[PDB]
Amino acid sequence: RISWVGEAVKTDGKKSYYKKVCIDAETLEVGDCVSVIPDDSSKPLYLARVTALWEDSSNGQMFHAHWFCAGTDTVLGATSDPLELFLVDECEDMQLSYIHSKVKVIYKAPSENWAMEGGMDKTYFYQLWYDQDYARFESPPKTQPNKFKFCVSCARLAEMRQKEIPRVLEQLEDLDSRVLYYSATKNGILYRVGDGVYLPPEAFTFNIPVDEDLYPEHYRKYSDYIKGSNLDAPEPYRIGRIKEIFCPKKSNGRPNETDIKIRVNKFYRPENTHKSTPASYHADINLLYWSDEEAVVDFKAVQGRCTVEYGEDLPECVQVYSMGGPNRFYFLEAYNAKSKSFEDPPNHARLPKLRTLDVFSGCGGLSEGFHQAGISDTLWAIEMWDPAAQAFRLNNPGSTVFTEDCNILLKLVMAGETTNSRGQRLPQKGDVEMLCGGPPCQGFSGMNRFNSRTYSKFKNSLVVSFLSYCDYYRPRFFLLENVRNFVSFKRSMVLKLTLRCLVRMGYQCTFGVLQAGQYGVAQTRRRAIILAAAPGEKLPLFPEPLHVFAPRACQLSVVVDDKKFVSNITRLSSGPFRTITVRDTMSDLPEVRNGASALEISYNGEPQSWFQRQLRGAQYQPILRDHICKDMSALVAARMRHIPLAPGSDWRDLPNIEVRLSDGTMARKLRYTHHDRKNGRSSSGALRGVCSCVEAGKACDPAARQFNTLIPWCLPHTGNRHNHWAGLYGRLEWDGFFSTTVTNPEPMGKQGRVLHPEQHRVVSVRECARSQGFPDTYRLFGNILDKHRQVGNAVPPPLAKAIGLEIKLCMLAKA
DNA sequence: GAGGCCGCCTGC
DNA sequence: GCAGGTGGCCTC
Ligand SMILES: Nc1ncnc2c1ncn2[C@@H]1O[C@H](CSCC[C@H](N)C(=O)O)[C@@H](O)[C@H]1O
Ligand SMILES: [Zn+2]
Ligand SMILES: [Zn+2]
């Protein structure tokens, strides 16, 4: 049968504990690993570590099973090592009758000389702990012993439970109906009387028909959807100052400490006063107004903690305070809602950087963000394209910039070479502490029709070149950025093989999708991010959103092999700061014409928004650089001049007129040869089809093509299968956001919403840089198309900065 | 170079 | 059907 080895060690109620057991041949101990056959006989064997052995008074002999995770059930899937398992926080008590056999598993700890093992290329083994929800591989926790029957998974799942439960800490006074407290804790955050709190926007309230003859293609706007619009963006958090923490005293009288309430003073954002949304235009994004309005909410509703300080009692200035920490707000005046006026507030309101190598550096958007975060000095940068190399050099005088193929340069280092052919010193093992880069996006971009032409192999891709840098140099931290489609390209195989390489090297790693607009730009730009960290390090979290942003642009979850993954991000429906708009981004720039080429002009005025104050910098700038526009042809310029200024205007609003051009001498009038039965006809009975495509799908006749037309011919030609080419020749809206900033803004590109909100022209280089969050002092290089490409390829610095601050926490938390 | 032209997949 | 895709090729 199954008899016990020895006697009992613990006496706990209906369970008699033991230390070791014997099942028919085999002595079994705690710490031993076993196998368990599943109920589904088709499924493979289950594996676990034994952490407890006991006997119940009603049921048979029991044991506690800390489950292992097979690699094939992680995000790796079929690319996993068959013998690799991963620790997880899953466990359960089971009958000893379920144990099939004892199995040996080894722990493959990284070597003490792991950072030098790079470049040199029948038993279960594990090296990493896995999180099934966030696709995180991490070093095994160090939760020591809960002395004998110490399950690792139980210890931290309970520690996670206490961390998440709202608890009061220090009583302050026992009143008639409530018990006042001085402090409370929640999700690891300590709240005390006087602190600031984030609250959901619903926590409390405050005390305050077209003439189809001339515009024929107007019918194609039946969708009534406006790309770039900010009508459905959520409100930012409510902010309040804790006045009381308290619990209902029961009918007996002791406090019910499971039902914690807080009373707060309401803070007004500028846009919450009688001066509505326009009040936000010029104000700092973290300016508040004190108010004497109070509100009671449940402690559970608190979304986080913030600092709200009286402005004039701060020892440093307001800019040094605002730039020196997260979640920092300030106030100067108070708001009297009934008086609708502003009064003075009452009296009762008063690490050394990492040496970084930037591969595919571009002009340096990613490196600039990491520098702003204060974590890195990019001492080496590799960039094959000379104009972008030169841009990087102008902004980073202490950096060694290699205008080199990254493949060639790594081959040189691996062969023992100390310098490149220019005489520049090559980084060696030990020099590189951080490795970051965005490989070209163009092979993964969904707009690329012809990705099926040249690049087919993964072994020969720049992504693998980049991982070879990681393997060779073995940096403390690693970052790879790309377009969102990187996670889904080739049924997610590229994502899975990248993560597979990292764990094979011994790296902790993870991946996620981030929306740049949630970190401080007026732009929808969803980017995939792989983070990795060396074994002795802490793996960074993805940064919590700072700005609210339109929900349709914030779909960040990723399906891989019928398993949905999300990142650690918990701010899903609100955030501390309002959204950044096209107005915030470029309302201060002077008017220029189509084809403006003056490289250095006057600003003609001071910065207007917080965002412009931040990007123009503290030091006075007498000259505005690179506010230059592509010189569009007479036809295209004539098209832009008749795109209405109203929000949502694009090619579909173009009049059907002939127009004399500046230097094209005439633009022809497109007319509807054949009929579209799907779309019908307009008030006049006009055909509504422009080619032989729209009848029965037969073929295009070249006679139906109409050259040099004002309404471009190719857009009605294929609009029915392209959603009416929405956005092409489209204007931005002052209250909206940019669509994705691309390398060459052109009104008939797929991302065609490139027209200025008021001027008859494509957005300038400076405006594109502003949409990416570049400081106005950030140097670009080359002709105007070179400059557009450097900006369009770049990681927005505010996004890179947010990621970098997460890396900073890991630098501080290690030692 | 400048511009016109414009597939296919994902996710809903 | 709708909405989104740091775009590329081909012809002048
Ligand atoms: N084989 C190669 N070696 C080095 N750089 C390369 C390369 N192939 C392409 N590149 C460069 O890689 C870059 C990808 S775009 C990267 C932009 C950068 N992350 C920023 O924030 O500015 C392009 O600038 C391209 O010129
Ligand atoms: Zn357990
Ligand atoms: Zn046709």
Output phi, psi for A218, to 5 deg. -65, -25
Read out DSSP for A525-545?
-EEEEEEEE-TTSPPPPPPPP
Question: From residue A98, how far is each of A65, A93, A104 by CA, in Å?
Answer: 11, 11, 18
| Burial class for A740, CB neighbours closer than 10 Å (0-12, 13-18, 19+) | buried
Virtual torsion, Cα A490, A494, A496, A500, nearest 10 deg: 150
C-beta separation of A555 from A524 below 8 A:
no
Read out DSSP for A769-791?
HHHTT--TT----SSHHHHHHHH
A407 annotated among ligand-binding-site residues: no
Token readout for A658 is 């002939």
C-beta separation of A615 from A679 below 8 A:
no
Token readout for A139 is 């070093």
Residue A388 CA, ligand 1 centroid: distance in Å: 8
Residue A43: alpha-carbon gap to chain centroid: 37
A59 annotated among ligand-binding-site residues: no
Q: Measured on CA atoms in the order A655, A661, A667, A669, is the torsion positive or negative? A: positive
A441 counts as catalytic: yes
Token readout for A330 is 């300030």
Geometric angle at alpha carbon A387, from A382 and A392, rounded to 5°: 50
Spatial distance between the Cα atoms of A407 and A462, rounded to a whole number of angstroms: 8
Token readout for A400 is 């060694």
Amino acid at A247: C
Q: Which nucleotides of chain B have an atom under 7 angstroms from any protein CB?
A: 1-12
Virtual torsion, Cα A650, A652, A656, A657, nearest 10 deg: 10
Q: Measured on CA atoms in the order A388, A394, A399, A402, is the torsion positive or negative? A: positive
Token readout for A737 is 């956001």
Containing H/E element for A814?
helix A797-814
Q: Which nucleotide is nearest to A746 (CA to C1')?
A: B3
The angstrom resolution of this structure is 2.2
Q: How many CB atoms lie within 10 A of CB A319?
A: 12
Q: How many CB atoms lie within 10 A of CB A613?
A: 16
Question: From residue A258, how far is each of A65, A255, A366, A608 by CA, in Å?
Answer: 32, 9, 46, 48
Closest residue, by C-alpha, to the C1' of C7? A448
Token readout for A74 is 């992680």
Residue A278: alpha-carbon gap to chain centroid: 28
Spatial distance between the Cα atoms of A393 and A302, rounded to a whole number of angstroms: 46
C-beta separation of A503 from A137 below 8 A:
yes
Find where tokens 């085999």 sit: A26
Output phi, psi for A21, to 5 deg. -130, 165
Amino acid at A706: Q
List all residues 6 or more positions away from A36 whose beta carbon is below 8 Å from its beta carbon: A45, A46, A47, A48, A65, A94, A98, A99, A100
Q: How many CB atoms lie within 10 A of CB A166?
A: 17
Read out DSSP for A54-120?
EEESSS-EEEEEEEEEEGGGSTTGGGS-TTEEEEEEEEEEEEGGGEEEE--EEE-PPPTTGGG-TT-
Experimental method: X-ray
CA-closest candidate to residue A770, choices A654, A653, A616: A616
Pairing relationship of beta strands A328-336 and A287-290 according to DSSP bridges: parallel
- Enter the CATH code of domain A354-581+798-813: 3.40.50.150
CA-closest candidate to residue A525, choices A226, A746, A225, A792: A792
- The contacts found for A486-493 with CB under 8 angstroms, 24 or more apart, are A486/A441, A486/A444, A486/A528, A487/A511, A487/A513, A487/A528, A487/A558, A487/A560, A488/A558, A488/A559, A489/A444, A491/A561, A492/A558, A492/A560, A492/A561, A493/A79, A493/A458
C-beta separation of A70 from A92 below 8 A:
no
Token readout for A810 is 């890991």
C-beta separation of A610 from A587 below 8 A:
no
Gaps in chain A (C to N distance exceeding 2.5 A) after: 121, 145, 208, 350
CA-closest candidate to residue A769, choices A746, A743, A750, A749: A743
A384 annotated among ligand-binding-site residues: yes
CA-closest candidate to residue A715, choices A639, A794, A778: A639
A357, β-bridge pairs: A380, A435
Spatial distance between the Cα atoms of A322 and A361, rounded to a whole number of angstroms: 30
Q: Measured on CA atoms in the order A514, A515, A519, A523, is the torsion positive or negative? A: positive
C-beta separation of A258 from A302 below 8 A:
no
- DSSP 3-state of A164: helix
Token readout for A218 is 């107007």
Q: Which nucleotide is nearest to A450 (CA to C1')?
A: C8
Spatial distance between the Cα atoms of A103 and A99, rounded to a whole number of angstroms: 11
List all residues 6 or more positions away from A435 whose beta carbon is below 8 Å from its beta carbon: A356, A357, A359, A469, A470, A473, A475, A477, A478, A479
Give the N- to C-terminal CA distance of chain A in Å, as an integer.
53
C-beta separation of A365 from A795 below 8 A:
yes
Question: From residue A590, how far is each of A165, A767, A793 by CA, in Å?
Answer: 54, 11, 25
Geometric angle at alpha carbon A596, from A590 and A597, rounded to 5°: 115
Residue A659 CA, ligand 3 centroid: distance in Å: 25
Token readout for A785 is 């198309």
Read out DSSP for A439-462?
--STTT-TT-TTTTSS---STTSH
A365 annotated among ligand-binding-site residues: yes
DSSP A253: S
Pairing relationship of beta strands A600-601 and A624-625 according to DSSP bridges: antiparallel
A178, β-bridge pairs: A248
Buried/exposed code over A208-221 (b: 16+ C-beta within 10 A; e: otherwise): eeeebeebbbebbb
C-beta separation of A525 from A498 below 8 A:
no
Output phi, psi for A448, to 5 deg. -80, 105
Spatial distance between the Cα atoms of A76 and A500, rounded to a whole number of angstroms: 6
Spatial distance between the Cα atoms of A699 and A429, rounded to a whole number of angstroms: 61
DSSP A738: B
Spatial distance between the Cα atoms of A373 and A551, rounded to a whole number of angstroms: 27
In this structure, chain A runs to a length of: 815
Token readout for A398 is 């202490």
Q: Which nucleotides of chain C have an atom under 7 angstroms from any protein CB?
A: 2-9
Amino acid at A96: L
A405 annotated among ligand-binding-site residues: yes
Ligand 1 atom index nearest CA of A405? 3
C-beta separation of A268 from A288 below 8 A:
yes
Ligand 1, CB cutoff 6 Å, lining residues = A 360-366, 382-385, 388, 405-407, 438, 440, 462, 793-795
- DSSP 3-state of A180: strand
Spatial distance between the Cα atoms of A540 and A806, rounded to a whole number of angstroms: 6
C-beta separation of A748 from A722 below 8 A:
no
Residue A26 CA, ligand 3 centroid: distance in Å: 78
CA-closest candidate to residue A194, choices A37, A298, A296, A306: A306
Task: Please write down the HEC assignment for all residues of A584-616.
Answer: HHHCCCCCCCCCCCCCEECCCCCCCCHHHHHHH
Q: Active site residue: A441, A470, A554, A810, which one?
A: A441
Amino acid at A192: R
Residue A383 CA, ligand 1 centroid: distance in Å: 5
Residue A682: alpha-carbon gap to chain centroid: 45
Output phi, psi for A510, to 5 deg. -170, 170
CA-closest candidate to residue A731, choices A802, A641, A797, A669: A641
CA-closest candidate to residue A737, choices A567, A515, A588, A569: A515
Q: Which nucleotide is nearest to A794 (CA to C1')?
A: C6
Output phi, psi for A124, to 5 deg. -60, 145
How many alpha carbons lie under 13 Å from residue A512 in its C-beta half-sphere? 22
Ligand 1 atom index nearest CA of A382? 4
Spatial distance between the Cα atoms of A335 and A343, rounded to a whole number of angstroms: 6
Token readout for A25 is 């041949």
Token readout for A37 is 């056959």
C-beta separation of A185 from A559 below 8 A:
no
A174, β-bridge pairs: A179
Spatial distance between the Cα atoms of A501 and A137, rounded to a whole number of angstroms: 12
C-beta separation of A149 from A10 below 8 A:
yes
Query: What angle, rounded to 10 degrees, do the helices at A386-395 and A784-792 form?
Result: 70
The separation, in Å, between residue A446 CA and nucleotide B6 C1' comes to: 13
- Ligand 1 atom 19, closest CA: A438
Footprint of strand C on the protein (CB under 7 A): A 222-223, 225, 227, 438, 440-442, 445-450, 453-454, 481-485, 524-527, 552-553, 723, 726-727, 739-740, 742-744, 749-751, 792-793
Containing H/E element for A304?
strand A304-310
Containing H/E element for A797?
helix A797-814
- DSSP 3-state of A215: coil
Q: Which nucleotide is nearest to A451 (CA to C1')?
A: C8
Buried/exposed code over A375-402 (b: 16+ C-beta within 10 A; e: otherwise): bbbbbbbbbbbebbbbbbbebbeebbbb
Spatial distance between the Cα atoms of A82 and A76, rounded to a whole number of angstroms: 11
